[PDB]
Amino acid sequence: YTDYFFDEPAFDLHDGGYVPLEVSDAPEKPLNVPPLLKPDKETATDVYYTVTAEAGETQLLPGAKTKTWGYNTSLLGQTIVYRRGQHTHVTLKNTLPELTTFHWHGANVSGPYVDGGCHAPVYPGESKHIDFTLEQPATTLWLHAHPCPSTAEQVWHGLAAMVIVKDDHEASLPLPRNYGVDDIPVILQDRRFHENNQWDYRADYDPDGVAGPTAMINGTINPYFDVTTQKVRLRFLNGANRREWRLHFADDLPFTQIGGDGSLLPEPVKFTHLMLTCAERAEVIVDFGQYHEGDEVTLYTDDVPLLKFRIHAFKPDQTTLPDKLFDVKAPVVDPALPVRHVVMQGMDEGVAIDGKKFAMQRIDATQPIGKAQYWDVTNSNDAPGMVHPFHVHGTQFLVLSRNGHAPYPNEHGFKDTIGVNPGETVRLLVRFDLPGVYMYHCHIIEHEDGGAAAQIETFDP
Amino acid sequence: SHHH
Ligand SMILES: [Cu+2]
Ligand SMILES: [Cu+2]
Ligand SMILES: [Cu+2]
Ligand SMILES: [Cu+2]
Ligand SMILES: [Cu+2]
Ligand SMILES: [Cu+2]
Ligand SMILES: [Cu+2]
């Protein structure tokens, strides 16, 4: 028995071109925690932010600095806090040598301009302004680049940032919430270092997914984290181009998932082993109560150590989580509407959706706003296949079934990305609140760039 | 506990 929910035969580690992680010989160092991006101005009703994509240099390994890109920093980005109900104004500035896109993955905003996908280019040296008001539950989202094609290369350079959404309900729960002390991002990525400590996407390119052997956690090699509280909230984001993370602690220390892509979970779910596909988020609580000062607990993926938790002195907490975290209010399907069938096909260069590759001017589907529809999403890859993380812009969906059976224990909240196993049909409940144009695609980023993407137009009827 |  595998400890994870996905189908073992389909794990990334069965690919012929699989790249194992190796522990780097680089020095151990403190986990970089990206600072909170300070607003330009904030009132209760409004918040103003400037977000600048920029090119710089980061000391990742001894010797030469790695050339990297980031938002408001050299690599990755400062964490951006949004609040449900607050009118948000954002100045998007591009100081890169390439055009880019500012994609708010999981933010229910209008498409395709505010959404910041393929049709929202910001050229070098120019600025754009956007505004929106999030009307969605508290969760962890993220920002990343999304020029079509060239998404994979821009993310590789380092254009990803964690986005936190706050709401009244979540503020009232007994959760670690002191950012950088007991509540931290865990942005899981891999890279390959070449001569002079540089990255080289083009040398490492593979149409089925790029992965390197060195794990990078919040832009840090060989990180440790100093624990100064009994409980810690980890916001896991899989920011890798392709790699799956199979997370567990030494000695199978339990942890509890309280959150998924789009919302808190309806109920807490206890885990010893958690698998995350690309773009998935999982918020977990780890209780270090059994441990004493000077102890050490290692977070692993498979047999490879990722992050070392060094236990300092902490005040007792021993709080309980309620049995119910969040009320999931499922919409009613519109019974006039057919079941939508979406089929992901191919591997390597042959990836496609419903028989076609992406065309920027072509609309592939329509759906009325405010009306929930069943989407049946199929991964048609015969064995041996791979888990395809399917993502829909502009919405948070609910998962109803997997091959006619229950979703996984941690998939009863709102989600925007779901891993579809080979041969599997998952049934989703999908509603768009806002009119415009939205993409759906595989979130193995090389698959997206290789054309495994379609666009849907939503309209007011 | 090795993994896989
Ligand atoms: Cu206003
Ligand atoms: Cu404005
Ligand atoms: Cu994304
Ligand atoms: Cu997205
Ligand atoms: Cu184990
Ligand atoms: Cu996308
Ligand atoms: Cu794919």
Side-chain angles (χ1 to χ4, degrees), chain A residues 1-40 42-92 94-128 130-149 151-269 271-289 291-317 319 321-328 330-360 362-381 383-461, chain B residues 2-4:
Chain A
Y1 296 10
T2 180
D3 288 299
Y4 309 96
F5 300 143
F6 292 92
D7 299 334
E8 184 279 346
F11 294 171
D12 57 348
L13 59 74
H14 294 115
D15 187 292
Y18 181 64
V19 173
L21 291 170
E22 302 165 54
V23 178
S24 168
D25 286 339
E28 284 183 55
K29 71 183 69 54
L31 179 67
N32 173 69
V33 172
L36 295 170
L37 178 67
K38 181 171 177 171
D40 300 323
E42 191 179 15
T43 75
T45 61
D46 291 72
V47 61
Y48 298 80
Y49 288 113
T50 301
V51 176
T52 304
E54 61 184 65
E57 290 188 341
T58 309
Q59 199 81 64
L60 293 177
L61 300 176
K65 294 189 185 183
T66 306
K67 293 194 171 185
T68 56
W69 294 355
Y71 302 109
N72 300 123
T73 189
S74 68
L75 172 60
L76 290 180
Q78 288 185 58
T79 298
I80 301 172
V81 179
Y82 294 142
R83 294 196 165 64
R84 175 184 195 134
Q86 175 181 55
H87 195 198
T88 296
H89 309 269
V90 188
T91 304
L92 308 176
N94 181 10
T95 65
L96 301 165
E98 288 186 355
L99 85 77
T100 193
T101 268
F102 292 86
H103 180 51
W104 307 96
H105 182 118
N108 298 351
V109 300
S110 89
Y113 299 118
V114 179
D115 185 60
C118 311
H119 307 270
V122 183
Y123 285 90
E126 79 166 3
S127 300
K128 301 283 184 159
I130 57 171
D131 35 69
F132 55 87
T133 311
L134 301 181
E135 291 300 343
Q136 66 183 286
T139 196
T140 307
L141 305 181
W142 58 314
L143 162 64
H144 67 74
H146 200 312
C148 303
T151 291
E153 157 266 318
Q154 290 208 348
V155 168
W156 196 258
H157 279 284
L159 293 188
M162 177 157 290
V163 171
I164 294 178
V165 179
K166 303 282 203 195
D167 77 1
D168 284 342
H169 177 69
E170 178 272 356
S172 89
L173 290 170
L175 302 175
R177 61 210 314 115
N178 182 11
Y179 178 82
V181 175
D182 61 0
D183 173 13
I184 52 169
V186 180
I187 303 169
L188 298 166
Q189 307 183 295
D190 63 46
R191 291 286 181 282
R192 189 182 289 279
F193 288 89
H194 298 260
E195 187 184 346
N196 294 131
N197 301 333
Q198 304 305 308
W199 297 335
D200 188 357
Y201 180 76
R202 287 297 144 196
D204 301 331
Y205 176 77
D206 173 335
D208 211 41
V210 169
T214 306
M216 189 171 69
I217 324 292
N218 300 351
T220 318
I221 316 300
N222 284 341
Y224 69 77
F225 182 73
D226 293 313
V227 175
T228 70
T229 57
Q230 195 187 325
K231 296 196 177 190
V232 176
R233 182 176 187 173
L234 306 173
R235 301 176 191 256
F236 291 119
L237 159 66
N238 184 353
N241 280 45
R242 191 262 171 274
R243 190 174 300 279
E244 297 157 352
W245 306 93
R246 278 175 288 279
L247 297 168
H248 64 276
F249 288 91
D251 295 338
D252 289 342
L253 173 65
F255 49 90
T256 305
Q257 195 177 163
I258 62 159
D261 307 343
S263 78
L264 299 150
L265 307 185
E267 301 182 346
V269 182
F271 278 97
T272 61
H273 304 78
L274 176 64
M275 181 164 155
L276 296 179
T277 62
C278 296
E280 284 190 296
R281 283 84 70 201
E283 298 194 37
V284 306
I285 308 295
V286 189
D287 190 354
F288 289 113
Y291 292 90
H292 304 282
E293 186 162 14
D295 287 335
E296 186 280 333
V297 189
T298 298
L299 181 66
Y300 287 82
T301 182
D302 295 314
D303 51 349
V304 175
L306 287 182
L307 179 56
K308 290 189 185 163
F309 290 90
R310 292 175 180 176
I311 309 301
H312 292 275
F314 58 78
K315 306 189 175 188
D317 187 12
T319 259
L321 296 165
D323 294 11
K324 294 186 174 176
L325 291 166
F326 172 76
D327 187 54
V328 173
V332 182
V333 269
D334 185 344
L337 232 43
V339 170
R340 188 189 301 285
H341 293 97
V342 176
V343 185
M344 295 184 288
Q345 318 157 136
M347 289 185 302
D348 322 299
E349 305 181 320
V351 294
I353 302 201
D354 299 317
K356 296 178 170 187
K357 284 182 182 286
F358 175 79
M360 212 166 312
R362 188 187 71 240
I363 302 297
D364 301 286
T366 66
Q367 179 174 164
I369 70 161
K371 278 160 185 173
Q373 186 177 17
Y374 292 137
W375 289 29
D376 284 351
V377 188
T378 300
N379 175 356
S380 55
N381 295 10
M386 62 200 305
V387 179
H388 289 242
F390 178 84
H391 172 57
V392 183
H393 291 213
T395 184
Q396 295 286 343
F397 54 71
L398 295 168
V399 188
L400 298 185
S401 62
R402 281 179 169 281
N403 276 339
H405 302 122
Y408 295 154
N410 60 1
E411 305 177 323
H412 297 278
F414 289 99
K415 283 178 63 56
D416 54 54
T417 304
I418 184 171
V420 186
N421 293 275
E424 178 181 44
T425 303
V426 300
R427 176 161 285 182
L428 302 187
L429 191 59
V430 184
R431 186 171 67 188
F432 298 91
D433 298 340
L434 295 168
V437 176
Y438 302 95
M439 276 171 63
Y440 54 98
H441 59 89
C442 178
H443 210 297
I444 293 164
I445 311 178
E446 284 69 37
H447 289 179
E448 186 200 303
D449 284 345
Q455 42 194 181
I456 184 168
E457 171 174 347
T458 62
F459 61 94
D460 199 325
Chain B
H2 295 347
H3 260 284
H4 208 89

Short mmCIF file of all heavy atoms in Angstrom, two decimals, chain A residues 221-266:
data_model
loop_
_atom_site.label_atom_id
_atom_site.label_comp_id
_atom_site.label_asym_id
_atom_site.label_seq_id
_atom_site.Cartn_x
_atom_site.Cartn_y
_atom_site.Cartn_z
N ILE A 221 18.04 26.81 -0.77
CA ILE A 221 18.63 25.48 -0.84
C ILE A 221 19.01 25.06 0.58
O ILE A 221 19.62 25.84 1.31
CB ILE A 221 19.88 25.47 -1.74
CG1 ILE A 221 19.69 26.24 -3.05
CG2 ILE A 221 20.35 24.03 -1.99
CD1 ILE A 221 18.57 25.72 -3.93
N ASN A 222 18.68 23.81 0.94
CA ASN A 222 18.97 23.21 2.23
C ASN A 222 18.47 24.08 3.38
O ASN A 222 19.21 24.39 4.31
CB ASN A 222 20.45 22.85 2.34
CG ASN A 222 20.81 21.61 1.56
OD1 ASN A 222 19.93 20.81 1.21
ND2 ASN A 222 22.09 21.43 1.28
N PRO A 223 17.17 24.44 3.42
CA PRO A 223 16.64 25.28 4.49
C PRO A 223 16.37 24.54 5.80
O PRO A 223 16.03 23.36 5.77
CB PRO A 223 15.33 25.78 3.85
CG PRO A 223 14.86 24.57 3.08
CD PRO A 223 16.13 24.00 2.47
N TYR A 224 16.54 25.26 6.92
CA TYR A 224 15.96 24.85 8.20
C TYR A 224 15.06 25.99 8.69
O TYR A 224 15.27 27.15 8.33
CB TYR A 224 17.03 24.53 9.26
CG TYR A 224 17.81 25.75 9.75
CD1 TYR A 224 17.25 26.65 10.65
CD2 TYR A 224 19.09 26.01 9.29
CE1 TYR A 224 17.94 27.77 11.08
CE2 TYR A 224 19.80 27.12 9.73
CZ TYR A 224 19.23 28.00 10.63
OH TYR A 224 19.92 29.10 11.03
N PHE A 225 14.10 25.64 9.55
CA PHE A 225 13.17 26.62 10.10
C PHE A 225 13.14 26.50 11.62
O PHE A 225 12.89 25.41 12.13
CB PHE A 225 11.74 26.44 9.55
CG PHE A 225 10.80 27.50 10.11
CD1 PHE A 225 10.89 28.82 9.69
CD2 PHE A 225 9.88 27.18 11.10
CE1 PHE A 225 10.05 29.80 10.22
CE2 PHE A 225 9.05 28.17 11.64
CZ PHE A 225 9.14 29.47 11.20
N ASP A 226 13.35 27.63 12.31
CA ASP A 226 13.35 27.67 13.77
C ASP A 226 11.92 27.77 14.31
O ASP A 226 11.28 28.81 14.19
CB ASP A 226 14.18 28.83 14.31
CG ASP A 226 15.69 28.77 14.07
OD1 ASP A 226 16.30 27.70 14.32
OD2 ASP A 226 16.26 29.82 13.68
N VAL A 227 11.44 26.68 14.92
CA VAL A 227 10.09 26.61 15.48
C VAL A 227 10.07 27.22 16.88
O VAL A 227 10.77 26.72 17.76
CB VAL A 227 9.65 25.14 15.52
CG1 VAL A 227 8.31 24.96 16.21
CG2 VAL A 227 9.62 24.51 14.13
N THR A 228 9.24 28.24 17.11
CA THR A 228 9.11 28.85 18.44
C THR A 228 7.67 28.82 18.94
O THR A 228 7.28 29.70 19.72
CB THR A 228 9.64 30.28 18.41
OG1 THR A 228 8.71 31.03 17.64
CG2 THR A 228 11.05 30.37 17.84
N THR A 229 6.87 27.84 18.51
CA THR A 229 5.49 27.67 18.93
C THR A 229 5.18 26.19 18.84
O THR A 229 5.85 25.47 18.11
CB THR A 229 4.51 28.50 18.10
OG1 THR A 229 4.66 28.12 16.73
CG2 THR A 229 4.72 30.00 18.21
N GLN A 230 4.17 25.72 19.59
CA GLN A 230 3.84 24.31 19.60
C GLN A 230 3.29 23.90 18.24
O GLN A 230 3.57 22.81 17.74
CB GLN A 230 2.82 23.98 20.69
CG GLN A 230 2.72 22.49 21.01
CD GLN A 230 1.59 22.17 21.96
OE1 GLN A 230 1.27 22.94 22.87
NE2 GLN A 230 0.94 21.04 21.75
N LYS A 231 2.47 24.79 17.66
CA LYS A 231 1.77 24.52 16.42
C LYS A 231 2.31 25.46 15.35
O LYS A 231 2.63 26.60 15.64
CB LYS A 231 0.26 24.67 16.64
CG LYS A 231 -0.28 23.65 17.62
CD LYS A 231 -1.78 23.45 17.62
CE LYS A 231 -2.16 22.36 18.57
NZ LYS A 231 -3.57 22.00 18.43
N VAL A 232 2.42 24.94 14.12
CA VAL A 232 2.84 25.73 12.97
C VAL A 232 1.87 25.48 11.82
O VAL A 232 1.51 24.34 11.54
CB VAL A 232 4.29 25.41 12.55
CG1 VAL A 232 4.70 26.17 11.30
CG2 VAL A 232 5.28 25.70 13.67
N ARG A 233 1.47 26.57 11.15
CA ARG A 233 0.68 26.49 9.93
C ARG A 233 1.61 26.55 8.71
O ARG A 233 2.33 27.54 8.53
CB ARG A 233 -0.30 27.67 9.89
CG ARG A 233 -1.25 27.75 8.70
CD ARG A 233 -2.18 28.93 8.94
NE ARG A 233 -3.30 29.11 8.02
CZ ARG A 233 -4.27 30.02 8.19
NH1 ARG A 233 -4.32 30.75 9.29
NH2 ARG A 233 -5.20 30.17 7.27
N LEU A 234 1.60 25.48 7.91
CA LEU A 234 2.34 25.44 6.66
C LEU A 234 1.36 25.61 5.49
O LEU A 234 0.42 24.83 5.36
CB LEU A 234 3.10 24.12 6.57
CG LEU A 234 4.01 23.80 7.76
CD1 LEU A 234 4.56 22.41 7.59
CD2 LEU A 234 5.12 24.83 7.90
N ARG A 235 1.59 26.64 4.67
CA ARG A 235 0.88 26.83 3.42
C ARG A 235 1.71 26.26 2.27
O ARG A 235 2.52 26.97 1.66
CB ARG A 235 0.62 28.32 3.18
CG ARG A 235 -0.19 28.98 4.28
CD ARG A 235 -0.34 30.47 4.03
NE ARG A 235 -0.89 31.17 5.19
CZ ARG A 235 -2.13 31.62 5.34
NH1 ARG A 235 -3.04 31.45 4.39
NH2 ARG A 235 -2.46 32.24 6.47
N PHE A 236 1.48 24.98 1.95
CA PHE A 236 2.16 24.32 0.84
C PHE A 236 1.62 24.79 -0.50
O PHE A 236 0.42 24.73 -0.74
CB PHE A 236 1.98 22.80 0.84
CG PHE A 236 2.69 22.09 1.97
CD1 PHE A 236 1.98 21.36 2.91
CD2 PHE A 236 4.08 22.12 2.06
CE1 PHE A 236 2.64 20.69 3.92
CE2 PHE A 236 4.73 21.46 3.08
CZ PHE A 236 4.01 20.74 4.01
N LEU A 237 2.52 25.24 -1.38
CA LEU A 237 2.20 25.50 -2.77
C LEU A 237 3.17 24.70 -3.63
O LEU A 237 4.38 24.80 -3.47
CB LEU A 237 2.29 26.99 -3.09
CG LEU A 237 2.47 27.36 -4.57
CD1 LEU A 237 1.27 26.97 -5.39
CD2 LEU A 237 2.78 28.84 -4.75
N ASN A 238 2.62 23.89 -4.54
CA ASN A 238 3.45 23.23 -5.53
C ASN A 238 3.68 24.20 -6.68
O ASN A 238 2.81 24.36 -7.53
CB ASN A 238 2.84 21.91 -5.99
CG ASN A 238 3.74 21.17 -6.95
OD1 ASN A 238 4.77 21.71 -7.37
ND2 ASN A 238 3.39 19.94 -7.30
N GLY A 239 4.85 24.85 -6.68
CA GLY A 239 5.22 25.82 -7.70
C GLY A 239 6.21 25.23 -8.71
O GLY A 239 6.93 25.97 -9.38
N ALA A 240 6.24 23.89 -8.81
CA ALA A 240 7.16 23.20 -9.70
C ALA A 240 6.58 23.15 -11.11
O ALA A 240 5.36 23.22 -11.28
CB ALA A 240 7.43 21.80 -9.19
N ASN A 241 7.47 22.99 -12.09
CA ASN A 241 7.06 22.92 -13.49
C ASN A 241 6.28 21.62 -13.67
O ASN A 241 5.24 21.65 -14.32
CB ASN A 241 8.23 23.15 -14.43
CG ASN A 241 8.56 24.62 -14.59
OD1 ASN A 241 8.61 25.36 -13.60
ND2 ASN A 241 8.77 25.07 -15.82
N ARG A 242 6.76 20.51 -13.07
CA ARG A 242 6.13 19.21 -13.25
C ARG A 242 6.09 18.31 -12.01
O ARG A 242 5.18 17.49 -11.87
CB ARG A 242 6.90 18.47 -14.35
CG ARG A 242 6.20 17.21 -14.85
CD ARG A 242 6.71 15.94 -14.22
NE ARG A 242 5.90 14.75 -14.54
CZ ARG A 242 4.81 14.34 -13.90
NH1 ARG A 242 4.19 15.13 -13.03
NH2 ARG A 242 4.42 13.09 -14.05
N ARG A 243 7.09 18.42 -11.13
CA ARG A 243 7.31 17.44 -10.08
C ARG A 243 6.09 17.36 -9.15
O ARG A 243 5.48 18.38 -8.84
CB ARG A 243 8.55 17.79 -9.25
CG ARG A 243 8.97 16.69 -8.29
CD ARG A 243 10.29 17.00 -7.60
NE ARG A 243 11.42 17.16 -8.52
CZ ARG A 243 12.11 16.18 -9.06
NH1 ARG A 243 11.81 14.92 -8.80
NH2 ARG A 243 13.13 16.44 -9.86
N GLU A 244 5.78 16.13 -8.73
CA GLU A 244 4.84 15.85 -7.66
C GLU A 244 5.60 15.75 -6.34
O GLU A 244 6.69 15.21 -6.31
CB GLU A 244 4.18 14.48 -7.88
CG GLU A 244 3.34 14.40 -9.15
CD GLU A 244 3.12 13.00 -9.68
OE1 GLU A 244 3.74 12.03 -9.18
OE2 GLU A 244 2.31 12.88 -10.62
N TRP A 245 5.01 16.27 -5.26
CA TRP A 245 5.61 16.20 -3.93
C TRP A 245 4.81 15.23 -3.07
O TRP A 245 3.58 15.33 -3.00
CB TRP A 245 5.65 17.59 -3.29
CG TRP A 245 6.33 18.61 -4.16
CD1 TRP A 245 5.73 19.44 -5.05
CD2 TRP A 245 7.75 18.87 -4.24
NE1 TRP A 245 6.67 20.21 -5.68
CE2 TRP A 245 7.92 19.89 -5.21
CE3 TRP A 245 8.88 18.37 -3.58
CZ2 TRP A 245 9.17 20.40 -5.54
CZ3 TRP A 245 10.12 18.88 -3.91
CH2 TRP A 245 10.26 19.86 -4.89
N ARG A 246 5.52 14.28 -2.46
CA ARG A 246 4.93 13.25 -1.61
C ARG A 246 5.46 13.46 -0.20
O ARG A 246 6.50 12.93 0.15
CB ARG A 246 5.19 11.86 -2.19
CG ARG A 246 4.20 11.51 -3.30
CD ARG A 246 4.55 10.19 -3.93
NE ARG A 246 5.76 10.29 -4.75
CZ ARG A 246 5.80 10.75 -6.00
NH1 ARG A 246 4.68 11.05 -6.65
NH2 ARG A 246 6.97 10.97 -6.58
N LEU A 247 4.70 14.24 0.58
CA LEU A 247 5.21 14.89 1.77
C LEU A 247 4.92 14.03 2.99
O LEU A 247 3.83 13.49 3.14
CB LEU A 247 4.55 16.26 1.89
CG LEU A 247 4.85 17.25 0.76
CD1 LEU A 247 3.92 18.44 0.85
CD2 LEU A 247 6.31 17.69 0.80
N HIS A 248 5.93 13.92 3.87
CA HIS A 248 5.77 13.30 5.17
C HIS A 248 6.93 13.69 6.06
O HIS A 248 7.99 14.10 5.57
CB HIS A 248 5.66 11.78 5.04
CG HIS A 248 6.89 11.15 4.50
ND1 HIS A 248 7.14 11.07 3.15
CD2 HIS A 248 7.95 10.59 5.11
CE1 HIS A 248 8.30 10.47 2.96
NE2 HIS A 248 8.81 10.17 4.13
N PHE A 249 6.72 13.58 7.38
CA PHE A 249 7.75 13.84 8.36
C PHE A 249 8.45 12.54 8.73
O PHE A 249 7.88 11.47 8.55
CB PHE A 249 7.14 14.53 9.59
CG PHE A 249 6.74 15.97 9.33
CD1 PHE A 249 5.47 16.28 8.89
CD2 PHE A 249 7.66 16.99 9.50
CE1 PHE A 249 5.12 17.60 8.63
CE2 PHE A 249 7.31 18.30 9.25
CZ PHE A 249 6.04 18.60 8.81
N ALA A 250 9.68 12.65 9.24
CA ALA A 250 10.35 11.55 9.92
C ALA A 250 9.51 11.10 11.12
O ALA A 250 8.97 11.92 11.85
CB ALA A 250 11.72 12.00 10.37
N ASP A 251 9.40 9.78 11.30
CA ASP A 251 8.64 9.19 12.39
C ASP A 251 7.14 9.39 12.17
O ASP A 251 6.35 9.26 13.10
CB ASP A 251 9.10 9.71 13.75
CG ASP A 251 10.53 9.36 14.17
OD1 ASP A 251 11.09 8.37 13.65
OD2 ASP A 251 11.08 10.10 15.02
N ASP A 252 6.75 9.71 10.93
CA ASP A 252 5.35 9.81 10.53
C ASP A 252 4.57 10.71 11.48
O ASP A 252 3.40 10.45 11.78
CB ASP A 252 4.77 8.42 10.32
CG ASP A 252 5.27 7.68 9.08
OD1 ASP A 252 5.83 8.35 8.18
OD2 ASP A 252 5.12 6.44 9.03
N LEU A 253 5.20 11.81 11.91
CA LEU A 253 4.52 12.84 12.67
C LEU A 253 3.26 13.27 11.92
O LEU A 253 3.34 13.71 10.77
CB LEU A 253 5.47 14.02 12.87
CG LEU A 253 4.85 15.26 13.52
CD1 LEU A 253 4.40 14.98 14.94
CD2 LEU A 253 5.81 16.44 13.49
N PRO A 254 2.06 13.12 12.53
CA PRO A 254 0.81 13.55 11.89
C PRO A 254 0.76 15.06 11.69
O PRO A 254 1.45 15.80 12.38
CB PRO A 254 -0.28 13.07 12.86
CG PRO A 254 0.39 11.97 13.65
CD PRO A 254 1.82 12.46 13.82
N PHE A 255 -0.04 15.47 10.71
CA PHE A 255 -0.39 16.88 10.54
C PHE A 255 -1.83 16.90 10.04
O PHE A 255 -2.33 15.89 9.56
CB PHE A 255 0.60 17.56 9.60
CG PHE A 255 0.85 16.81 8.30
CD1 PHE A 255 0.07 17.05 7.18
CD2 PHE A 255 1.84 15.83 8.22
CE1 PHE A 255 0.29 16.35 6.00
CE2 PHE A 255 2.05 15.13 7.05
CZ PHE A 255 1.28 15.40 5.94
N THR A 256 -2.46 18.07 10.13
CA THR A 256 -3.87 18.19 9.81
C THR A 256 -4.05 19.20 8.69
O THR A 256 -3.58 20.34 8.79
CB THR A 256 -4.63 18.60 11.07
OG1 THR A 256 -4.31 17.65 12.08
CG2 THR A 256 -6.13 18.61 10.86
N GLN A 257 -4.76 18.81 7.63
CA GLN A 257 -5.07 19.74 6.56
C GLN A 257 -6.33 20.51 6.96
O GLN A 257 -7.33 19.91 7.33
CB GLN A 257 -5.21 19.05 5.20
CG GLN A 257 -5.18 20.04 4.03
CD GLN A 257 -5.24 19.42 2.65
OE1 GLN A 257 -5.53 20.10 1.66
NE2 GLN A 257 -4.97 18.13 2.54
N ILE A 258 -6.24 21.84 6.89
CA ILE A 258 -7.34 22.74 7.20
C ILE A 258 -7.79 23.48 5.95
O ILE A 258 -8.82 24.16 5.98
CB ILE A 258 -6.92 23.73 8.30
CG1 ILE A 258 -5.77 24.61 7.85
CG2 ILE A 258 -6.61 23.01 9.61
CD1 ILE A 258 -5.63 25.90 8.63
N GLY A 259 -7.02 23.38 4.85
CA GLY A 259 -7.24 24.23 3.70
C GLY A 259 -6.77 23.60 2.39
O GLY A 259 -5.79 22.86 2.35
N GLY A 260 -7.51 23.93 1.31
CA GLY A 260 -7.18 23.53 -0.04
C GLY A 260 -7.11 24.76 -0.94
O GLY A 260 -7.11 25.89 -0.46
N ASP A 261 -7.09 24.54 -2.26
CA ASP A 261 -6.82 25.60 -3.21
C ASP A 261 -7.70 26.82 -2.93
O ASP A 261 -7.20 27.94 -2.87
CB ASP A 261 -7.08 25.15 -4.64
CG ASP A 261 -6.38 23.88 -5.10
OD1 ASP A 261 -5.41 23.44 -4.42
OD2 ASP A 261 -6.84 23.31 -6.11
N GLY A 262 -9.01 26.58 -2.75
CA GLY A 262 -10.01 27.63 -2.88
C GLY A 262 -10.70 28.01 -1.57
O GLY A 262 -11.43 29.00 -1.54
N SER A 263 -10.50 27.21 -0.52
CA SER A 263 -11.21 27.44 0.73
C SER A 263 -10.62 26.56 1.83
O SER A 263 -9.87 25.63 1.55
CB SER A 263 -12.70 27.15 0.58
OG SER A 263 -12.98 25.76 0.59
N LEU A 264 -11.03 26.84 3.07
CA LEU A 264 -10.89 25.88 4.16
C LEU A 264 -11.60 24.61 3.72
O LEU A 264 -12.49 24.67 2.87
CB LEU A 264 -11.50 26.39 5.46
CG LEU A 264 -10.90 27.68 6.04
CD1 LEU A 264 -11.96 28.44 6.83
CD2 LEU A 264 -9.71 27.36 6.93
N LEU A 265 -11.18 23.48 4.30
CA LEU A 265 -11.91 22.24 4.15
C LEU A 265 -13.14 22.32 5.05
O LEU A 265 -13.09 22.96 6.10
CB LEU A 265 -11.03 21.04 4.52
CG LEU A 265 -9.68 20.94 3.80
CD1 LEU A 265 -8.99 19.63 4.18
CD2 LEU A 265 -9.79 21.06 2.29
N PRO A 266 -14.27 21.67 4.70
CA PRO A 266 -15.41 21.60 5.62
C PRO A 266 -15.04 21.03 6.99
O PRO A 266 -15.50 21.55 8.01
CB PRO A 266 -16.44 20.73 4.88
CG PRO A 266 -15.70 20.11 3.72
CD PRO A 266 -14.53 21.02 3.41
#
